[PDB]
Design a protein around this nucleic acid. Structure first.
Ligand SMILES: [K+]
Ligand SMILES: [K+]
Ligand SMILES: [Mg+2]
Ligand SMILES: [Mg+2]
Ligand SMILES: [Mg+2]
Ligand SMILES: [Mg+2]
Ligand SMILES: [Mg+2]
Ligand SMILES: [Mg+2]
Ligand SMILES: [Mg+2]
Ligand SMILES: [Mg+2]
Ligand SMILES: [Mg+2]
Ligand SMILES: [Mg+2]
Ligand SMILES: [Mg+2]
Ligand SMILES: [Mg+2]
Ligand SMILES: [Mg+2]
Ligand SMILES: [Mg+2]
Ligand SMILES: [Mg+2]
Ligand SMILES: [Mg+2]
Ligand SMILES: [Mg+2]
Ligand SMILES: [Mg+2]
Ligand SMILES: [Mg+2]
Ligand SMILES: [Mg+2]
Ligand SMILES: [Mg+2]
Ligand SMILES: [Mg+2]
Ligand SMILES: [Mg+2]
Ligand SMILES: [Mg+2]
Ligand SMILES: [Mg+2]
Ligand SMILES: [Mg+2]
Ligand SMILES: [Mg+2]
Ligand SMILES: [Mg+2]
Ligand SMILES: [Mg+2]
Ligand SMILES: [Mg+2]
Ligand SMILES: [Mg+2]
Ligand SMILES: [Mg+2]
Lengths: 199, 74, 134, 89
RNA sequence: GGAGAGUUUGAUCCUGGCUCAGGAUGAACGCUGGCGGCGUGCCUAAUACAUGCAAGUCGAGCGAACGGUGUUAGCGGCGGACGGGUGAGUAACACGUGGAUAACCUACCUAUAAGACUGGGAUAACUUCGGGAAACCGGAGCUAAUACCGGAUAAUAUUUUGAACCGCAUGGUUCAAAAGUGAAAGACGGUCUUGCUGUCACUUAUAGAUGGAUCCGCGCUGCAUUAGCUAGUUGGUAAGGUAACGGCUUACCAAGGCAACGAUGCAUAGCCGACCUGAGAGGGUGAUCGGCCACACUGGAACUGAGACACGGUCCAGACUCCUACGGGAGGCAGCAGUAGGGAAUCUUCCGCAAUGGGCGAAAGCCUGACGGAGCAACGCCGCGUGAGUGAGAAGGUCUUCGGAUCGUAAAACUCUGUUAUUAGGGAAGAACAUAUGUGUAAGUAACUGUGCACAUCUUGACGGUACCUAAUCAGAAAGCCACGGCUAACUACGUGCCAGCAGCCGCGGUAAUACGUAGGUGGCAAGCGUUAUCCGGAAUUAUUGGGCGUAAAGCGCGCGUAGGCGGUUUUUUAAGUCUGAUGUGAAAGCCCACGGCUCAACCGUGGAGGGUCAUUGGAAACUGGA
C-alpha cells in the first residue's frame, strides 16, 4: 500500500481495531513499544483531536497529504463538514471494493484496484482514491473473475451496507446512494477532526 | 453630439473648483480644491465672481477651459 | 485620537528589523556599492577560528571569524563536536544566533564547502553534514 | 489586416482553439478584437465547432479574412455559403 | 466566518515587549531518493561576450549571366516599426478607471464609383582598364522594367462669392459656383477579331474596419532633520511649425504661474489584471500568463517609410573589443542556445516547421530559436508504488523488580498479485487542409478561360514506434528524514561529569541528564524530511472595523488667537453628500460555483457569479451641505 508497517501496532496505539474485527486489541489493548504495559497519563486536548485524525487516516490507509485534501474537498459541499468528510472516505474505490466483499482486508482491496483487477462502469480503474458516485457499477476484470483471493472473500457473505448492492454470482456491485453517518464507523468522533483542522 | 465637462467655481485670479475627497480608510469627507486656468475672452469676470466653465481643446500651456457664464458677481 | 486627527496624521506601524542583517546585503564589485537581496546563506572565508566563553553557562564554544562575500565581518558558531576549520577556510554561513554567546549571530553550515561533517554522528546527521553510514 | 484565426489554449499535447478576430500583428495568444467561437480538433467523436454565425458574417463583410483552417471551419458550418450568397444578392 | 501558549513575582492581578504553534516561495543548503502527469527554472552583473542559428520572399515586375526546362548575383516590390528580449530610466496623463477631439493620422484588408491616355531619359547588373592586405574604391562604355521623370484627362481637396440650417465658444453639415491645382502599369491567361475579355496588380474619391496620436476628471511610495520653486517661466498678439491643439518655437508686450490641499529637491519604484496572506478590514509581492509603457553598449541626430527617430538599419561622438601588409578596416546576445564572471542559486551550443500564428508569393512553396516538441533539475503540485492473505509469541537487539517485557504477525513458513520493472507483439488522436482533378451552382461574359461558393478524389507527423493495449517472468531492483522535559504527538538504558556539547523560548550539563552523544523503543511525516532566508497571520502590538494617556509609555507650564474641524430650534427651497432604479463600461486568463474531458487527481475546457471611491441619466427628500 503506502504504509506497509504493522497494522497490529497501529491499532493498539490508536485504540481502534483497524481490521474491523478486534483480533489486534486481543491480548494487549495497550500502546506498542517498551512503555506499553506501563500506563501513561491522560491525553491533552491536542492529543485527543490528533488521535481521532489518525484513527480515520489509518483505517482508510491514506497519507496525510491525501487525507487533508479530501477534507478540503468535503468542506465545500452543503451540509455538516465532518459528516461529508466521512461520506467521501467511504466512497473511495479502495473502500467500496472492501465493503462489497471482494477482499478480506482493506489492504487486499487496495492491491486489487492498484493491480488493475477492478472495473468501474465497465472500464478499468487503477486508482485506489477514485471517488465512486451513486449509480456506478464495480466489477472484476474477465481475466480475474476466478482468482482465489476474490473467490474466498465472496463466499464469506458479510453485512454489505445498505447504501451498496452486490451480486455475488455476477461479481458485480452497485453504488446505490450516498451513505449516512449511521452506516459509517461510529468509533470516530469526527467533530474532533474538524476541530483539529481549525487549529 | 457629446458632452464636455462643466464646473462651477470662484475666480481666484483675474477658477477654484473646491470638491470633496472621501478618505480611503476613515470615510470622512475632506475638502480639496483645484485651480482651473480658463479663457475669459474679453476679460469680463473679476475676482470673487462665481462662474461656470466648460472643457475645451488646449488653448495655451495650461488653459483647457472656457468661461461660459458668470453666476454670482464679485 | 479623533477621526480628524487620524485624517491629518494617519497611523504608522513599527518597522520590523532583521535578525541576520549580514545575509540580506550583496556587493557589486564593479560599482563598489551595497545591494539588498535577502540571501538564505552566504559564502565566506575564515579569518580567525578559536573559542569563546559563554555568558550561567560555562564552556569553550568554538567559532570562526568570517569575511562574507559582501565584505562584511561576522562571528559564526561552529556546531557539532569536532571541526576541520582554520584560517583561510572557505565556509558557508547561515542565519541563527547562538544564545549565551554575545556577538555571534550566524552559524556555519556543516558539510558545505570546506567544512566537514561531524565525525561519528548517527542521529540528526543532516543537521551536521554527515553522510549515511554503511 | 484583420484576421479570423485560431488562438491556442489547452495544455501540452492537448490543444484547444478559440476562434478570434484579431489584428494580424497581434501575438497569437495576445490581444484580440472579438471571439466568435471555439474549435477542438482532438475531441472524441466530432471536432466540436461552436461558431457564432451572426458575428462571423459581420466581420467577413467588414473585410476580415480567415486563415486556412478557419476558412474550413466556417465552410463546415455553412457560413461561407451564406457570405457568398449575401454578397451577390 | 474569528482557538492559543511560554516568559517579569516568594506568590498575585495588571501593563508591556519578546518567543512559539499556521500559510507561502523563482528559493538555497544538509541527509536521502522509485515512477508518471502537469507546470516552473539567472531574483545577483541593464556585467563582458567565443561559435551557430533568431527575416526573408517574389522569375506570373525586369535585364543579364551560368547551366540544361533550371539556377546565380543584380535592379524593382512588399516585409524587415510584427513576432522575440529586458525592466535600466521614469513619481509622469507612465499606468488604472472614466470621458473628449467641432484640434487628429492610418500601409496591407473590404465595399462603392470613376479611370488607367501619351512621351522621355537614366542606371545597377554586365564588359573593359586600373587602384588597394583587406574593407572596398575609381575610369570607360552597355541596358531593362510594375524603377524614375515630363505632358494630357479626373476634384469631394484649395481660394473667393455667398446662402440655408444647426452646435458646445472657436465653429459644424449641406447647397452652390467660378478660379487655379493633383494620377495611374503591367504580368500571366482565354477567345481570337488583334478587338474584346478573366485573375492579380495600378490611380483617384468616399465610407467601413484596423492600428496609432493628443487632451481632460479621479486614483499613484517615503523624507519637512527637504520651504520656497519657476523667467519660455505664466498670459497675450503675430509669425513659424506639426497629422493635430498648444510656449511647440521665435519676436515683441504684460508680470504672472506653482506651494503647507506639500510646491520644489533628494531617495526609491516600470504600472495594472493578477499573486500570497488574512474571518474581514487590511498587510505584502509584481517571477510565470495577458494589457500598457520604456529601453536595445553610452549620448546626440536624421534618412526611408503608412508607420521608426528603428534590438539583429544609417550618420556622428565616446568607452571597449578584434583584423591590419599601418594606409586602413570591423563589432554590439536585455533573440535562442552557449561561455566567462558575479553569486547561496537557476537548464541543451537539441528536433521540426507536422499543428497554431506571422512575412513574401497567383500558387506550389520558401522563411520563421514565434511556436510545437524533446533534453536536464524532487523546484512545486497531483497521482501510484516500494507488496497482499494466513501466520503463536522462534532466534537476535534492547530493557528488566532475571518472573519477564518489548521490537512483534513483525520474521520465517504456506499461498496470492504484477500497479511498477524486464522481454516481446500490436499501436491512436493530435491532419485541418492547400494545390491539383473532376462535376454542380452564383455573378459576370457576346462566349470562354478564370473568380466566389458546394461536393467528391489526392498528399502531409517533429514528437515517435511516444501514449496506450496485449502476453510472459519475478517479491524479486524501489525508505528515508526529523523529533520524543514543557509549549508539542512520542521514554528508557549506557557514556559524559558546568566538560564535551544542546538551545525558538523557558533553559539543559558541575557523578543516578526522559534536554548533551550513542543505542533500543516510540511519534510525526514520507519520495521526501529537516535548516536557513523572506512575507502575511497569530499581534486588538498603529486599534476605521478594533487601544490608550491620575499612579504602568502618554495632557503642551499657561493664555490669546489664524487656518481647519465641529456646531442650538423651526419653516420654505435646493439637490453637492445620502438613498433608489436605467444604460454603458470594469478584456481574456485567474479566484469562487456548476458542468464536461483527462482511468482518478493535478490539469484542461465550457457556462455563470464577483470585483468601481466609474461614468451618464430618471426619481426620493429625513439627515449633512448650499440659499
Ligand atoms: K521565578
Ligand atoms: K508553420
Ligand atoms: Mg479528426
Ligand atoms: Mg515537465
Ligand atoms: Mg534579470
Ligand atoms: Mg552586455
Ligand atoms: Mg534572384
Ligand atoms: Mg494600394
Ligand atoms: Mg512606380
Ligand atoms: Mg529601477
Ligand atoms: Mg486579524
Ligand atoms: Mg518620410
Ligand atoms: Mg530592426
Ligand atoms: Mg543582438
Ligand atoms: Mg543567449
Ligand atoms: Mg561562482
Ligand atoms: Mg501557415
Ligand atoms: Mg534561416
Ligand atoms: Mg535538493
Ligand atoms: Mg505529550
Ligand atoms: Mg540535537
Ligand atoms: Mg547517566
Ligand atoms: Mg528538550
Ligand atoms: Mg538526546
Ligand atoms: Mg506525493
Ligand atoms: Mg509576522
Ligand atoms: Mg503579526
Ligand atoms: Mg495597549
Ligand atoms: Mg484624555
Ligand atoms: Mg514613574
Ligand atoms: Mg507615566
Ligand atoms: Mg496642565
Ligand atoms: Mg515642563
Ligand atoms: Mg486532470
Amino acid at each position: 500500500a503506502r504504509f506497509r508497517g504493522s497494522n497490529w501496532k497501529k491499532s493498539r496505539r490508536l485504540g481502534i481495531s483497524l481490521s474491523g474485527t478486534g483480533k489486534e486489541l486481543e491480548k494487549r489493548p495497550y500502546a506498542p513499544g517498551q512503555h506499553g504495559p506501563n500506563q501513561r497519563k491522560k491525553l491533552s486536548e491536542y492529543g485527543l483531536q490528533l488521535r481521532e485524525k489518525q484513527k480515520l487516516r489509518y483505517l482508510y490507509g491514506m497519507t496525510e497529504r491525501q487525507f487533508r485534501n479530501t477534507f478540503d474537498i468535503a468542506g465545500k459541499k452543503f451540509g455538516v463538514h465532518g459528516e461529508n468528510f466521512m461520506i467521501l472516505l467511504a466512497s473511495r474505490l479502495d473502500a467500496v471494493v472492501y465493503s462489497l466483499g471482494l477482499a478480506r482486508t482493506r489492504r487486499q482491496a487496495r492491491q486489487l484496484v492498484n493491480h488493475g483487477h477492478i472495473l468501474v462502469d465497465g472500464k478499468r480503474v487503477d486508482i485506489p482514491s477514485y471517488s465512486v458516485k451513486p449509480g456506478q457499477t464495480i466489477s472484476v476484470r474477465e481475466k480475474s473473475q476466478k482468482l482465489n483471493i476474490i473467490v474466498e472473500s465472496v463466499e464469506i457473505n458479510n453485512f454489505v451496507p445498505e447504501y451498496l448492492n452486490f451480486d455475488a454470482d455476477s461479481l458485480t456491485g452497485t453504488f446505490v446512494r450516498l451513505p449516512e453517518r449511521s452506516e459509517l464507523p461510529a468509533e470516530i468522533n469526527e467533530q474532533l477532526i474538524v476541530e483539529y483542522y481549525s487549529r | 453630439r457629446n458632452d464636455r465637462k462643466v464646473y462651477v467655481g470662484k475666480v481666484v485670479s483675474d477658477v477654484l473648483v473646491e470638491t470633496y475627497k472621501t478618505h480611503k480608510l476613515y470615510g470622512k469627507r475632506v475638502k480639496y480644491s483645484k485651480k482651473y486656468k480658463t479663457h475669459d475672452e474679453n476679460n469680463s469676470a473679476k475676482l470673487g465672481d462665481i462662474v461656470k466653465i466648460q472643457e475645451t481643446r488646449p488653448l495655451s500651456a495650461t488653459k483647457r477651459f472656457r468661461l461660459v457664464e458668470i453666476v454670482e458677481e464679485s | 485620537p479623533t477621526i480628524n486627527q487620524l485624517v491629518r496624521k494617519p497611523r504608522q506601524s513599527k518597522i520590523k528589523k532583521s535578525d541576520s542583517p549580514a545575509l540580506n546585503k550583496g556587493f557589486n564589485s564593479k560599482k563598489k556599492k551595497f545591494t539588498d537581496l535577502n540571501s538564505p546563506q552566504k559564502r565566506g572565508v575564515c579569518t580567525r577560528v578559536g573559542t569563546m566563553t559563554p555568558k550561567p553557562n560555562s564552556a569553550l564554544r568554538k567559532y570562526a571569524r568570517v569575511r562574507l562575500s559582501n565584505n562584511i565581518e561576522i562571528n559564526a558558531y561552529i556546531p557539532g563536536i569536532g571541526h576541520n576549520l582554520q584560517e583561510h577556510s572557505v565556509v558557508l554561513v547561515r542565519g541563527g544566533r547562538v544564545k549565551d554567546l554575545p556577538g555571534v549571530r550566524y552559524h556555519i553550515v556543516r558539510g558545505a564547502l570546506d567544512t566537514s561533517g561531524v565525525d561519528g554522528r548517527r542521529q540528526g546527521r543532516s543537521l551536521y553534514g554527515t553522510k549515511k553510514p554503511k | 489586416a484583420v484576421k479570423i484565426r485560431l488562438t491556442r489554449l489547452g495544455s501540452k499535447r492537448n490543444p484547444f482553439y478559440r476562434i478570434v478576430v484579431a489584428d494580424a500583428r497581434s501575438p497569437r495568444d495576445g490581444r484580440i478584437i472579438e471571439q466568435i467561437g471555439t474549435y477542438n480538433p482532438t475531441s472524441a467523436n466530432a471536432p466540436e465547432i461552436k461558431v457564432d454565425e451572426a458575428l462571423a458574417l459581420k466581420w467577413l463583410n467588414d473585410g476580415a479574412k480567415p486563415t486556412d483552417t478557419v476558412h474550413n471551419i466556417l465552410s463546415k458550418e455553412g457560413i461561407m455559403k451564406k457570405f457568398d450568397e449575401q454578397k451577390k444578392a
